[PDB]
Design a binder for this molecule. Structure first.
Ligand SMILES: O=C(O)[C@]1(F)CN(c2ncnc3[nH]c4cc(Br)ccc4c23)CC12CCC2
Length: 167
């Protein structure tokens, strides 16, 4: 038993809710919140901009030190940093950005990072301003992640479409 509330169960291990991931993280304080990161950990907009704003820019400060030490992530890769006031840990995961021409096959590699964590709160990777089809992202999630994932979908219209079209 965990504290996630109001989710629709899609499969044995995947759950979904129409929710603001920032508000959900602040209420649940999960062990892991996933950020929709880019390789530079520049958290300007989308989910990343919202999560970073909620940390009063502490996420960005920590991220800039990470990059200065380690260099950029790979598309499809991840790193574990602090969750600040939102979670114990933040798993920064880089999905391919279609608006940069990145290979959508890398979306499966991106979701594989979730399997290193028993339970996660997450957005749909490569959705929103990353330009991929969220229905496809949900399909890859379900077919790749084996650990327990709680997906927060900000847009109610999109949430209803994801549920109603789910196979
Ligand atoms: O960035 C995009 O375009 C997204 F559509 C939006 N994301 C979110 N997901 C879940 N809760 C979210 N709360 C927010 C608050 C603000 Br302000 C901005 C974005 C979000 C957000 C998912 C997405 C990132 C990968 C696809």
């Amino acid at each position: 038993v965990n504290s996630f509330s109001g989710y629709l169960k899609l499969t044995d291990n995947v759950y979904i809710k129409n929710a603001d991931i920032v508000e959900e993280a602040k209420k649940v304080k999960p062990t892991v919140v996933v950020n929709a990161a880019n390789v530079y950990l520049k958290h300007g907009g989308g989910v990343a901009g919202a999560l970073n704003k909620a940390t009063n820019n502490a996420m960005q400060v920590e991220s800039d030190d990470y990059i200065a030490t380690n260099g950029p992530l790979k598309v499809g890769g991840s790193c574990v940093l602090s969750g600040h006031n939102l979670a114990k840990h933040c798993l920064h995961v880089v999905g391919p950005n279609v608006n940069k021409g990145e290979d959508i096959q890398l979306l499966k590699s991106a979701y594989e990072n979730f399997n290193q964590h028993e339970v996660l709160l997450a957005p749909l990777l490569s959705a929103g301003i990353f330009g991929a089809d969220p229905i496809h992202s949900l399909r890859v999630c379900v077919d790749t992640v084996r650990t327990n994932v709680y997906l927060a979908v900000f847009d109610k219209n999109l949430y209803d479409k994801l549920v109603s079209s789910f196979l």
